[PDB]
Amino acid sequence: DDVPPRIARAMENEEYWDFDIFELEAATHNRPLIYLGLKMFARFGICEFLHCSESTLRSWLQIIEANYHSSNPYHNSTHSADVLHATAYFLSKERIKETLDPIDEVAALIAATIHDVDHPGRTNSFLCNAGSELAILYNDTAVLESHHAALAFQLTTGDDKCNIFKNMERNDYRTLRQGIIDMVLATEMTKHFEHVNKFVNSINKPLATLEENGETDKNQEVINTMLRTPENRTLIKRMLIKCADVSNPCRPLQYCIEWAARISEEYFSQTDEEKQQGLPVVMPVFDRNTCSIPKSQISFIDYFITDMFDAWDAFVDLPDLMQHLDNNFKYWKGLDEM
Numbered sequence: 158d159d160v161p162p163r164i165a166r167a168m169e170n171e172e173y174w175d176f177d178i179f180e181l182e183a184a185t186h187n188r189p190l191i192y193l194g195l196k197m198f199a200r201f202g203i204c205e206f207l208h209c210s211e212s213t214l215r216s217w218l219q220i221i222e223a224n225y226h227s228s229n230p231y232h233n234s235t236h237s238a239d240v241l242h243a244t245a246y247f248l249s250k251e252r253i254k255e256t257l258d259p260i261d262e263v264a265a266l267i268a269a270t271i272h273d274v275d276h277p278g279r280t281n282s283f284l285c286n287a288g289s290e291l292a293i294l295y296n297d298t299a300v301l302e303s304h305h306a307a308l309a310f311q312l313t314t315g316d317d318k319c320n321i322f323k324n325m326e327r328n329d330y331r332t333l334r335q336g337i338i339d340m341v342l343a344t345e346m347t348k349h350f351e352h353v354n355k356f357v358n359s360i361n362k363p364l365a366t367l368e369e370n371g372e373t374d375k376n377q378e379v380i381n382t383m384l385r386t387p388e389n390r391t392l393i394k395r396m397l398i399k400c401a402d403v404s405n406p407c408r409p410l411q412y413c414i415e416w417a418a419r420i421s422e423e424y425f426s427q428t429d430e431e432k433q434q435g436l437p438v439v440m441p442v443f444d445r446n447t448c449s450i451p452k453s454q455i456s457f458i459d460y461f462i463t464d465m466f467d468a469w470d471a472f473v474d475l476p477d478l479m480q481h482l483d484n485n486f487k488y489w490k491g492l493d494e495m
């Protein structure tokens with residue numbers, strides 16, 4: 158309501174893909190998730206759906222943003238604000254608007270907010286090797302991913318002031334809870350190709366099969382029938398949260414490079430700790446003393462991004478994102494200079 162001018166100007170073109178997320182981070186003083194959350198949740202009408210007040214939402218975005226570590230270069234509140242922004246953008250697109258229901262939009266925006274809450278700047282395999290409290294707690298299986306979702310609901314419902322789900326109906330909340338959990342757990346690295354293969358096989362290929370006829374009225378309702386099913390909506394939710402999470406290579410060049418440094422700094426810090434404590438080196442290529450960030454980003458984009466966003470683009474139609482993916486890939490290539 159009474160947003161200050163810097164933070165208000167920083168959130169001018171939040172609908173657009175081109176959005177200065179670090180200016181918002183600088184404006185908010187490492188509090189971008191609360192300000193960007195309030196606008197987006199209001200723009201979608203999330204507390205109107207959930208039957209929470211505006212005051213319950215402020216308290217909710219505060220306690221979650223508090224649990225995001227400022228010391229983490231990449232995995233902090235500004236990363237979640239970025240992922241929240243990419244999620245909303247995908248929800249706003251026509252394909253996703255005319256496929257998913259209102260409950261899915263709420264699950265997506267809530268999932269994006271919480272998906273890395275209380276991240277220790279360290280990977281799952283580091284915690285499993287180190288014998289961490291959470292690695293013992295989740296039995297070396299989806300350690301971070303389960304901790305995020307679990308804690309996110311411990312903070313939400315456990316206190317009355319933070320509980321945005323308090324006024325819901327038990328049947329609706331049970332669906333929404335299950336949907337959020339699935340979207341948060343779908344971000345795990347080890348399940349990458351399972352969720353990509355499932356998306357292409359059940360959405361892209363059958364949608365491509367249905368375009369053999371073209372744009373018939375009986376055929377369009379069949380295309381509506383098949384995609385909108387409970388199972389196929391879950392797959393689009395898994396694909397949207399996976400794309401939004403790792404959308405930084407599809408950003409404007411400056412933000413791509415800033416996100417590239419942060420995640421790289423974070424892996425160097427782990428690697429420096431791994432050799433210090435006598436741990437086995439899980440990500441040996443990511444050492445500050447041997448890692449080429451431009452070459453490493455090309456490999457990252459080759460392995461994870463190019464097939465995933467191609468599959469996603471064909472579904473949603475993302476000319477701006479894929480043109481950035483071409484420009485950013487070409488920039489990383491051009492930094493060899495040897």
Ligand SMILES: Nc1nc(Cl)nc2c1ncn2Cc1cc(OCC(F)F)cc(OC(F)F)c1
Pocket residue numbers: 343344345346347348349399402403405406416417420453454457461
């Ligand atoms: N630009 C970036 N470069 C690097 Cl190397 N990692 C980045 C990054 N942006 C986000 N990350 C996190 C990340 C995401 C990832 O895919 C997540 C999915 F599979 F769930 C796999 C990763 O392993 C390996 F590439 F390091 C790391």
Ligand SMILES: [Mg+2]
Pocket residue numbers: 272273301344
């Ligand atoms: Mg994560």
Ligand SMILES: [Zn+2]
Pocket residue numbers: 272273344402
């Ligand atoms: Zn993440």
